[PDB]
Protein backbone atom coordinates (compact mmCIF):
# COMPACT_ATOMS: atom_id res chain seq x y z
CA UNK A 1 0.00 0.00 0.00
CA UNK A 2 2.13 2.85 1.30
CA UNK A 3 5.67 1.62 0.66
CA UNK A 4 4.40 0.02 -2.52
CA UNK A 5 3.08 3.45 -3.53
CA UNK A 6 6.32 5.14 -2.48
CA UNK A 7 7.95 2.51 -4.66
CA UNK A 8 5.31 2.82 -7.38
CA UNK A 9 6.31 6.45 -7.93
CA UNK A 10 10.09 5.98 -8.14
CA UNK A 11 9.91 3.32 -10.86
CA UNK A 12 8.13 5.95 -12.94
CA UNK A 13 11.15 8.28 -12.76
CA UNK A 14 13.93 5.68 -12.83
CA UNK A 15 12.71 4.10 -16.07
CA UNK A 16 11.69 7.50 -17.44
CA UNK A 17 15.12 9.05 -16.89
CA UNK A 18 16.47 6.26 -19.10
CA UNK A 19 13.89 6.42 -21.90
CA UNK A 20 13.83 10.21 -22.26
CA UNK A 21 17.62 10.56 -22.26
CA UNK A 22 17.89 7.79 -24.86
CA UNK A 23 15.25 9.64 -26.88
CA UNK A 24 17.03 12.96 -26.34
CA UNK A 25 20.10 11.19 -27.69
CA UNK A 26 17.84 10.21 -30.59
CA UNK A 27 16.17 13.58 -31.21
CA UNK A 28 19.72 14.91 -31.57
CA UNK A 29 20.62 12.16 -34.03
CA UNK A 30 17.62 12.74 -36.30
CA UNK A 31 18.18 16.51 -36.48
CA UNK A 32 21.80 15.62 -37.25
CA UNK A 33 20.73 13.16 -39.94
CA UNK A 34 18.79 15.93 -41.70
CA UNK A 35 21.78 18.28 -41.57
CA UNK A 36 23.66 15.46 -43.25
CA UNK A 37 20.78 15.32 -45.72
CA UNK A 38 20.34 19.07 -46.18
CA UNK A 39 24.01 19.31 -47.08
CA UNK A 40 23.45 16.45 -49.52
CA UNK A 41 20.56 18.46 -50.99
CA UNK A 42 22.62 21.61 -51.48
CA UNK A 43 25.48 19.56 -52.94
CA UNK A 44 23.58 17.60 -55.58
CA UNK A 45 21.49 20.70 -56.22
CA UNK A 46 24.55 22.88 -56.80
CA UNK A 47 26.54 20.10 -58.49
CA UNK A 48 23.99 19.16 -61.15
CA UNK A 49 23.46 22.86 -61.82
CA UNK A 50 27.01 23.59 -62.96
CA UNK A 51 27.18 20.17 -64.61
CA UNK A 52 24.04 21.22 -66.49
CA UNK A 53 25.30 24.54 -67.87
CA UNK A 54 28.50 22.72 -68.82
CA UNK A 55 26.36 20.80 -71.31
CA UNK A 56 24.27 23.85 -72.22
CA UNK A 57 27.21 25.88 -73.52
CA UNK A 58 28.69 22.69 -74.95
CA UNK A 59 25.60 22.04 -77.05
CA UNK A 60 25.49 25.76 -77.81
CA UNK A 61 29.13 25.93 -78.95
CA UNK A 62 28.58 22.73 -80.92
CA UNK A 63 25.21 23.57 -82.49
CA UNK A 64 26.84 26.80 -83.68
CA UNK A 65 29.81 24.91 -85.10
CA UNK A 66 27.28 22.94 -87.16
CA UNK A 67 25.33 25.88 -88.57
CA UNK A 68 28.61 27.25 -89.92
CA UNK A 69 29.61 23.87 -91.35
CA UNK A 70 26.07 23.49 -92.71
CA UNK A 71 26.26 26.65 -94.83
CA UNK A 72 29.95 26.09 -95.59
CA UNK A 73 28.93 23.03 -97.59
CA UNK A 74 26.11 24.86 -99.35
CA UNK A 75 28.72 27.50 -100.20
CA UNK A 76 31.08 25.00 -101.82
CA UNK A 77 28.15 23.63 -103.82
CA UNK A 78 27.49 27.12 -105.16
CA UNK A 79 31.21 27.27 -105.93
CA UNK A 80 31.11 23.77 -107.43
CA UNK A 81 28.06 24.61 -109.53
CA UNK A 82 29.80 27.78 -110.70
CA UNK A 83 33.05 26.35 -112.07
CA UNK A 84 30.86 23.51 -113.39
CA UNK A 85 28.86 25.77 -115.72
CA UNK A 86 32.10 27.35 -116.93
CA UNK A 87 33.50 23.90 -117.70
CA UNK A 88 30.49 23.00 -119.83
CA UNK A 89 30.95 26.22 -121.79
CA UNK A 90 34.55 25.13 -122.33
CA UNK A 91 33.32 21.80 -123.72
CA UNK A 92 31.63 23.91 -126.40
CA UNK A 93 34.93 25.64 -127.17
CA UNK A 94 36.83 22.51 -128.18
CA UNK A 95 33.60 21.49 -129.92
CA UNK A 96 33.44 24.52 -132.21
CA UNK A 97 37.21 24.19 -132.69
CA UNK A 98 36.88 20.50 -133.52
CA UNK A 99 34.42 21.49 -136.26
CA UNK A 100 36.87 24.04 -137.64
CA UNK A 101 39.60 21.50 -138.36
CA UNK A 102 36.91 19.51 -140.17
CA UNK A 103 36.43 22.57 -142.37
CA UNK A 104 40.18 23.17 -142.37
Amino acid sequence: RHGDSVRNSKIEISELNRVIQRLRSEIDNVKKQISNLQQSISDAEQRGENALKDAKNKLNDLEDALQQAKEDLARLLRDYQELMNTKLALDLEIATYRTLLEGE
Partner: protein
Protein backbone atom coordinates in the same frame (compact mmCIF):
# COMPACT_ATOMS: atom_id res chain seq x y z
CA UNK B 1 5.12 9.29 13.28
CA UNK B 2 1.60 9.89 11.94
CA UNK B 3 2.48 13.42 10.84
CA UNK B 4 5.51 11.98 9.04
CA UNK B 5 3.30 9.46 7.22
CA UNK B 6 0.81 12.15 6.19
CA UNK B 7 3.88 14.17 5.21
CA UNK B 8 5.00 11.25 3.04
CA UNK B 9 1.51 11.25 1.53
CA UNK B 10 1.92 14.97 0.82
CA UNK B 11 5.20 14.05 -0.89
CA UNK B 12 3.38 11.36 -2.90
CA UNK B 13 0.83 14.00 -3.90
CA UNK B 14 3.67 16.33 -4.90
CA UNK B 15 4.96 13.42 -6.98
CA UNK B 16 1.44 13.00 -8.34
CA UNK B 17 1.95 16.63 -9.36
CA UNK B 18 5.45 15.88 -10.72
CA UNK B 19 5.15 12.48 -12.47
CA UNK B 20 2.16 13.91 -14.36
CA UNK B 21 4.43 16.67 -15.64
CA UNK B 22 6.89 13.88 -16.44
CA UNK B 23 4.80 11.23 -18.24
CA UNK B 24 3.37 14.03 -20.35
CA UNK B 25 6.43 15.99 -21.48
CA UNK B 26 7.47 12.61 -22.84
CA UNK B 27 4.27 12.78 -24.88
CA UNK B 28 5.35 16.27 -25.92
CA UNK B 29 8.82 14.84 -26.50
CA UNK B 30 7.60 11.78 -28.42
CA UNK B 31 5.60 13.98 -30.79
CA UNK B 32 8.63 16.22 -31.29
CA UNK B 33 10.46 13.34 -32.97
CA UNK B 34 7.37 12.33 -34.96
CA UNK B 35 7.75 15.82 -36.40
CA UNK B 36 11.41 15.23 -37.25
CA UNK B 37 10.91 11.80 -38.81
CA UNK B 38 7.95 13.18 -40.76
CA UNK B 39 10.32 15.87 -42.03
CA UNK B 40 13.28 13.58 -42.73
CA UNK B 41 11.42 11.27 -45.11
CA UNK B 42 10.15 14.31 -47.00
CA UNK B 43 13.70 15.60 -47.47
CA UNK B 44 15.14 12.31 -48.74
CA UNK B 45 12.13 12.36 -51.07
CA UNK B 46 13.01 15.80 -52.41
CA UNK B 47 16.60 14.61 -52.63
CA UNK B 48 15.64 11.58 -54.71
CA UNK B 49 13.49 14.01 -56.71
CA UNK B 50 16.26 16.54 -57.43
CA UNK B 51 18.93 13.93 -58.18
CA UNK B 52 16.33 12.19 -60.33
CA UNK B 53 15.34 15.49 -61.93
CA UNK B 54 18.86 16.52 -62.93
CA UNK B 55 20.08 13.05 -63.93
CA UNK B 56 17.31 12.76 -66.52
CA UNK B 57 17.88 16.33 -67.72
CA UNK B 58 21.48 15.32 -68.40
CA UNK B 59 20.57 12.00 -69.99
CA UNK B 60 17.99 13.58 -72.30
CA UNK B 61 20.22 16.41 -73.58
CA UNK B 62 23.41 14.33 -73.62
CA UNK B 63 21.43 12.31 -76.16
CA UNK B 64 20.83 15.41 -78.28
CA UNK B 65 24.49 16.45 -78.29
CA UNK B 66 25.34 12.90 -79.37
CA UNK B 67 22.76 13.01 -82.16
CA UNK B 68 24.29 16.37 -83.06
CA UNK B 69 27.85 15.02 -83.01
CA UNK B 70 26.75 12.26 -85.37
CA UNK B 71 24.76 14.61 -87.60
CA UNK B 72 27.79 16.91 -87.62
CA UNK B 73 30.29 14.15 -88.41
CA UNK B 74 27.88 13.04 -91.15
CA UNK B 75 28.32 16.22 -93.21
CA UNK B 76 31.95 16.78 -92.20
CA UNK B 77 32.71 13.64 -94.20
CA UNK B 78 30.33 14.79 -96.95
CA UNK B 79 32.16 18.11 -97.27
CA UNK B 80 35.47 16.30 -97.71
CA UNK B 81 33.85 13.87 -100.14
CA UNK B 82 32.50 16.85 -102.08
CA UNK B 83 35.85 18.60 -101.67
CA UNK B 84 37.29 15.85 -103.85
CA UNK B 85 34.49 16.02 -106.43
CA UNK B 86 35.26 19.74 -106.60
CA UNK B 87 38.93 19.07 -107.32
CA UNK B 88 38.17 16.38 -109.91
CA UNK B 89 36.07 18.82 -111.91
CA UNK B 90 38.69 21.51 -111.36
CA UNK B 91 41.39 19.20 -112.76
CA UNK B 92 39.27 18.88 -115.91
CA UNK B 93 38.35 22.57 -116.13
CA UNK B 94 41.97 23.72 -116.21
CA UNK B 95 42.74 20.82 -118.55
CA UNK B 96 40.01 22.13 -120.85
CA UNK B 97 41.83 25.47 -120.62
CA UNK B 98 45.19 24.27 -121.97
CA UNK B 99 43.50 22.70 -125.00
CA UNK B 100 41.64 25.80 -126.19
CA UNK B 101 44.82 27.70 -125.28
CA UNK B 102 46.86 25.66 -127.76
CA UNK B 103 44.10 24.73 -130.19
CA UNK B 104 44.30 28.50 -130.50
CA UNK B 105 48.08 28.59 -131.00
CA UNK B 106 47.85 26.24 -134.00
CA UNK B 107 44.88 27.71 -135.84
CA UNK B 108 46.97 30.79 -135.05
CA UNK B 109 50.12 29.22 -136.47
CA UNK B 110 48.03 28.37 -139.53
Amino acid sequence: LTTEIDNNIEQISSYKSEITELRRNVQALEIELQSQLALKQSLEASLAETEGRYCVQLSQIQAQISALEEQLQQIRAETECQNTEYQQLLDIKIRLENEIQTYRSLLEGE
